Each structure stands twice: as structure tokens, then as C-alpha cells.
């Protein structure tokens, strides 16, 4: 349904040239990668579906990706003046492309927002043709983009190459990209110190994402101060989630686990 070329970069002044790393998340799984310290200096296709495409495709992948890797170094020569530092600022410039197609084939809407220092520096909007710089620095960047038809070129790229390539990826994915592995559930009772038990519903190995688990008790959504952490992968691309709650001893059966997935059977 989605495909977003995540970019990232870091800088270590006084130690050479900056580093750049990139990935790709067709649907959710990762298929492409890049680095500035690797040995192949090309695109590495870890994916069972997108592996057989022509040598030109893998060979280029806009091999000027390591030209953007220097474009970012060029950018961090005026970003050094915008948030004025001297020379030593060890800083990151995140980039985020992305086109989201509809389940039938429509373009739906594409996304792109950039940030600096983990803080938003420029972004797109719903529809397109708009800039929303979030500092007194990137106002200059907003005006410069407004000058030479920048959003128009972004429109061209999004409505063209990103979404067409995502069609091609979906066609090549067959069922590997779209097979929707559902969760498998298990739980154990086990006690707490003296007068309490911990109900924990466990679901592992599911795919795709967008599943959340809220604690239930007699059908009510008592979203107490339950401590989850974040969305994590199970070592291959599969994700898993569990639950945690404190209940009094002898009084457990009232509590139940709510399981709902966009791909749930």
C-alpha cells in the first residue's frame, strides 16, 4: 500500500566527510539499503520478491544516490550559518520521501517532510504546492523553493515515478508483499508479590503492522497506566506485541485482552 525511501545522514566534523544511510519500506518490509562505509557501494536487495530485476536497475538505482550524499554536505555549509555554529556541529539531516497508493490503484496522496536536528525544517501538505517552514531560518528555504517551481517538480515525481514503481513492486510482490500473517495468541497466569497476578496476552509474528492491544475488563476500556514500549521487529520483518496489567489475587477472570487487526481473520 505504501513505499517510502527513508534517508538519513550524520556529520562528524574534523574526521573526513559526512555519512549517509538509506532504506526502503515497500509496504513495511525492508528491501533496499545504502551506506557510505560499505564495500559494495551499490544497492543491496534483501527481499524475496524484488531480486530478479535487470542489472541496470540495481546498478544505477540513481547511483547519484552517492551524489546526493555530497549534496547533503553542500547543504550543511549553509545550514551551518542558518543555525549559526562555527564548524564543529555534529548534526543530522533527515529526509523522507514517500507515495501512498490506493488499494485499487489510485494515487491517493504522497508525503514528504524533512527535518534538521530532529526538528522539522520543511514539509509538504495535503494536496501539494505549499511550504511550511518552522523557523526563522528555513523561511529563506521556503522562498527559494517557491521561486523555481519546486512543488511542481515534486508533483511530477510523485505522480510519476514513485507511484509507477510502487505499481511495479506490487506486481512483482505477488503474495510475498501481501500475505497478511495473523497473530498467534498465548498467555500465562503467574502471580505477583503476595496478593496480585499479571495477565499478559501475547501475540507474535504477525504482519502487516497497525495492530494495537488495549486491556479490557467486563467489556470496558479501562486504559490504566499500562507500560508498553514501542513497535519492534522479530528479526525478519515480523512484528509482535504483548500486554501487562496488575490485577488483585483471586480477581483475574474479569480482565480480557482486546485483539483487533486490519488484517485480522
Amino acid at each position: 500500500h505504501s513505499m517510502r525511501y527513508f534517508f538519513t545522514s550524520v556529520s562528524r566534523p574534523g574526521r573526513g566527510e559526512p555519512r549517509f544511510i538509506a532504506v526502503g519500506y515497500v509496504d513495511d518490509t525492508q528491501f533496499v539499503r545504502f551506506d557510505s562505509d560499505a564495500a559494495s557501494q551499490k544497492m543491496e536487495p534483501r527481499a524475496p520478491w524484488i531480486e530478479q530485476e535487470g542489472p541496470e536497475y540495481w546498478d544505477q538505482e540513481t547511483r547519484n544516490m552517492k551524489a546526493h550524499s555530497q549534496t547533503d554536505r553542500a547543504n550543511l555549509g549553509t545550514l551551518r550559518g542558518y543555525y549559526n555554529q562555527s564548524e564543529d556541529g555534529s548534526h543530522t539531516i533527515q529526509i523522507m520521501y514517500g507515495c501512498d497508493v490506493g488499494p485499487d490503484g489510485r494515487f491517493l496522496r504522497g508525503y514528504r517532510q524533512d527535518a534538521y536536528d530532529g526538528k522539522d525544517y520543511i514539509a509538504l501538505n495535503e494536496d501539494l504546492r505549499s511550504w511550511t517552514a518552522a523557523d526563522m531560518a528555513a523561511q529563506i528555504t521556503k522562498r527559494k523553493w517557491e521561486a523555481v517551481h519546486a512543488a511542481e517538480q515534486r508533483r511530477v515525481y510523485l505522480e510519476g515515478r514513485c507511484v509507477d514503481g510502487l505499481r511495479r513492486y506490487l506486481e512483482n510482490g505477488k503474495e510475498t508483499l501481501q500475505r497478511t500473517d495473523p497473530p498467534k495468541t498465548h498467555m500465562t497466569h503467574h502471580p505477583i508479590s503476595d496478593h496480585e497476578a499479571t495477565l499478559r496476552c501475547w501475540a507474535l509474528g504477525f504482519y502487516p503492522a497497525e495492530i494495537t492491544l488495549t486491556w479490557q475488563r467486563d467489556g470496558e476500556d479501562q486504559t490504566q497506566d499500562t507500560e508498553l514500549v514501542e513497535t519492534r521487529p522479530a528479526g525478519d520483518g515480523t512484528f509482535q506485541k504483548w500486554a501487562a496489567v496488575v490485577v488483585p489475587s483471586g480477581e483475574e477472570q474479569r480482565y480480557t485482552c482486546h485483539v483487533q487487526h486490519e488484517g485480522l481473520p
Partner: T-cell receptor
Framework: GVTQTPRYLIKTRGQQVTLSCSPI?????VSWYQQTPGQGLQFLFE?????QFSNSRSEMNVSTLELGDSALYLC?????????????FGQGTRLTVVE | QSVAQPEDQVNVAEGNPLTVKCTYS??????LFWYVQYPNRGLQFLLK??????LVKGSYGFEAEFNKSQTSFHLKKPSALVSDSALYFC?????????????FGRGTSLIVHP
């Protein structure tokens, strides 16, 4: 926008012209050239810190015309015109002249 | 400073990578900049160059590299875009108090007959 005004003008021989270049935003360097097929750009002139108006607006006054010498004029906009910096260019003042 | 582009007209079909030429002969640390003049419109810049890496990047897919063996920069691309009909020119900025900051020439025109 590096918006210009006017986008098109015609003048006879001799008198002065008023052409305006509007920078995008806060800037200090605004260049001037002549992108005619003949001769060269020659890097006409530019003011550094009023040496244009204070709000960076720039106007041209060519008191005496010599026929073809007024063909197509361009302005720039940049923060400081440093060695490693570039300047956006305005859509110019294409003003093909009559006899 | 003197900057020359001997090619007054370059013709490339839609099967041939683009090739143009830039030349210069100046002193100090020279900085070479490129620009594109789409017909009767602005002067967008796509191929900058200051220093550092040789095979300098470019917008869309264009690129060029600097060689001391010819004092050239040679805006090039493996497969130029479909339109690319403009008056690309190559200019150099000289050292001056406060900075001299496009003395290029007539450049050249590309026609992309399909």
C-alpha cells in the same frame, strides 16, 4: 519570486527607462546583466549594502539608449554573493526595441 | 578572467548521452558554475561546482567533473531528459575583495530530435 516589472517594454531612441526587480526576501546582493545575443554580459553593476533601496528593491535607469544596447536585462538575488554561494535570477525584462 | 565554450551548437539524438564542453584559464582557486536558460524564461541553476569531489552531482540526472588536464568541466549525462532544449552556459567567479560572485559566453543549444 524574483518578480520583475515590467515584463515587456518598448522605447524609442534617447530617453531613460525605469525597470524594477523585486527580490524574494531579505537579501543584500542583486546583480545586473544583459543577455543579448550580441557582445557580452559585461557584468554591468551591482550595489553592496547600498553601495537598490534598503528593503532590497532594485531599479534601473538607463538615461541614454543606443538602439540595440537594450535587448534583455536580468537581475539576481543572493544573501552575500560569497565565493561558495549562488544567486537566483529573475525572469528579466525582455524588451525588444523598435526603430 | 576568460571563459570559453567552443561548441556554439550541440546536437544529440534520443539515443546518445549528452556531451558539452566548458573551458577556462584563471588564477587562484577557480569556482565553476553552470546554468540552464529554458526558452524565454528564468535561468535556473542545476550544476554547481566549488571544490571537493571530482564527479560533482547535478539536478535531475545531469553531472560533470573537473580535470586539470584540460581545465574543463563538461556538463554531461548518460541519458538527457526529453526536452533539455536550452542555452546551457558555464561561468567562473574570480577572487575580489568581498567576493566577485555569470561570465560564461553564448553557451550552447541542445536539440533532442526523437
Amino acid at each position: 519570486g524574483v518578480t520583475q516589472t515590467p515584463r515587456y517594454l518598448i522605447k524609442t531612441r534617447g530617453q531613460q527607462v525605469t525597470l524594477s526587480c523585486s527580490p524574494i526576501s531579505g537579501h543584500r546582493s542583486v546583480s545586473w546583466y544583459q543577455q543579448t545575443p550580441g557582445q557580452g554580459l559585461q557584468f554591468l553593476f551591482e550595489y553592496f549594502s547600498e553601495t537598490q533601496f534598503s528593503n532590497s528593491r532594485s531599479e534601473m535607469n538607463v538615461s541614454t539608449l543606443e538602439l540595440g544596447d537594450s535587448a534583455l536585462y536580468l537581475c539576481a538575488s543572493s544573501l552575500a554573493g560569497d565565493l561558495g554561494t549562488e544567486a537566483f535570477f529573475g525572469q528579466g525584462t525582455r524588451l525588444t526595441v523598435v526603430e | 578572467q576568460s571563459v570559453a565554450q567552443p561548441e556554439d551548437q550541440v546536437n544529440v539524438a534520443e539515443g546518445n548521452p549528452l556531451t558539452v564542453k566548458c573551458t577556462y584559464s584563471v588564477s587562484g582557486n577557480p569556482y565553476l558554475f553552470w546554468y540552464v536558460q529554458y526558452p524565454n524564461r528564468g535561468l535556473q541553476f542545476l550544476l554547481k561546482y566549488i571544490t571537493g569531489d571530482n564527479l560533482v552531482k547535478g539536478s535531475y540526472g545531469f553531472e560533470a567533473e573537473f580535470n586539470k588536464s584540460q581545465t574543463s568541466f563538461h556538463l554531461k549525462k548518460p541519458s538527457a531528459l526529453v526536452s533539455d532544449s536550452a542555452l546551457y552556459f558555464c561561468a567562473v567567479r574570480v577572487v575580489t575583495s568581498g567576493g566577485s560572485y555569470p561570465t560564461f559566453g553564448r553557451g550552447t543549444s541542445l536539440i533532442v530530435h526523437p
